Design a binder for these strands. Structure first.
Ligand code: NA
Ligand code: NA
Ligand code: NA
Ligand code: NA
Length: 329
DNA sequence: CCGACGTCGCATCAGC
DNA sequence: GCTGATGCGA
DNA sequence: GTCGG
């Protein structure tokens, strides 16, 4: 549905969401506003009153009132006020740097640090993550066209197999669902030698990160432990041509017996996950990102069931296997 | 009326 | 030094 | 902020 349908209202609610999260530190209000904007974004009619909107789940009394004011005046007094406020606008802005959350943003602004330039001048006050976030501030806000995702995947899948051909690696996220662009790259990795009961062998991830660094694909590291890496990567510049933006990439090592529950979950979408979770319950199973387990008559979860593919999961709950490209809901 | 609204791996702080 | 809490991201 | 026990 076109943005000119309710884009004004949805923009307003998203701006409210950001201020609750970044300034008020009210995470649940952030999500309430986000949810309201989602349901409205999907609504295929131009809203004519707060009352019409209130019928939608997640739209309550107060948002209904704001929509009334917005519809009559083309704005919202409280939002106009907070936009102008130097402190709040700065705090809100600083959070766009990866590694700077509401707490760090507040603290920086309290001591007079309000702009990227200010940050640039105060490196000593920034942790490693925050320095990398600042360094790639613009690149991190750019999206990744699917063609670049495919090129990136080519590299990841090639180098993983080169380290050990028994690794299994899957790029997940909306990309796996066939999205035309991505925000980052999420890689789930496993190996037969690693299960929930056997060796947690703590070099499986390191060896892969290392090789990806060795071929100069991974350029920076935000964080890295035995099961999860978050960092930065860049396609080699196809020659004589402009250099590609630096991209965010996550790589997680998952036990083999939990790998497919992991792929399912990190492929999404979120709404699909929710519904699949519903259905599974109805069939007497509880599914999370790690395992699927039978529920007994009084609701006691038994042991995790063997899962050797995504479709195993669907089969446990009597659902026809659905392609990632059809998992919007 | 009033608590729930994922959860968790990693980096870093707070405290002992 | 260690343990647990907190910030952050996803 | 919204929902629901
Ligand atoms: Na409603
Ligand atoms: Na941030
Ligand atoms: Na942010
Ligand atoms: Na081999």
């Amino acid at each position: 549905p076109q943005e000119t349908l309710n884009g004004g209202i949805t923009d307003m609610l998203t701006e409210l969401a950001n201020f609750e999260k970044n300034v008020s530190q009210a995470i649940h209000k952030y999500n309430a506003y986000r949810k309201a904007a989602s349901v409205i974004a999907k609504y295929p009619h131009k809203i004519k009153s707060g009352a019409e909107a209130k019928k939608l789940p997640g739209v309550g009394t107060k948002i209904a009132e704001k929509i009334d004011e917005f519809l009559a005046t083309g704005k919202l007094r409280k939002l106009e006020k907070i936009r102008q406020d130097d402190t709040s606008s700065s705090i809100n802005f600083l959070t766009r740097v990866s590694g700077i959350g509401p707490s760090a943003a507040r603290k920086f602004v309290d001591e007079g640090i309000k702009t990227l330039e200010d940050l640039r001048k105060n490196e000593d006050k920034l942790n490693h993550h925050q320095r990398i976030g600042l360094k790639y501030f613009g690149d991190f806000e750019k999206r990744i066209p699917r063609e670049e995702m495919l090129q990136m995947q080519d590299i990841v899948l090639n180098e993983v197999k080169k380290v050990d051909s028994e690794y299994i690696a899957t790029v997940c996220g909306s990309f796996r669902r066939g999205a035309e662009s991505s925000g980052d790259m999420d890689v789930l990795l496993t190996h037969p030698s690693f299960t929930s009961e056997s060796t947690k062998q703590p070099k499986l991830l390191h060896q892969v990160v290392e090789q990806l660094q060795k071929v100069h694909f991974i350029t920076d590291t935000l964080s890295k432990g035995e099961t999860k890496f978050m960092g930065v990567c860049q396609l080699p510049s196809k020659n004589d041509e402009k250099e590609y933006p630096h991209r965010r990439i996550d790589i997680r090592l998952i036990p083999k017996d939990q790998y497919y529950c992991g792929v399912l979950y990190f492929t999404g979408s979120d709404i699909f996950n929710k519904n699949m979770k519903a259905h599974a319950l109805e069939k007497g199973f509880t599914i999370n990102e790690y395992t699927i387990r039978p529920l007994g008559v009084t609701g006691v979860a038994g042991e995790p069931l063997p899962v050797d593919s995504e479709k195993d999961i669907f089969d446990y709950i009597q659902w026809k296997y659905r392609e990632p490209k059809d998992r919007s809901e």
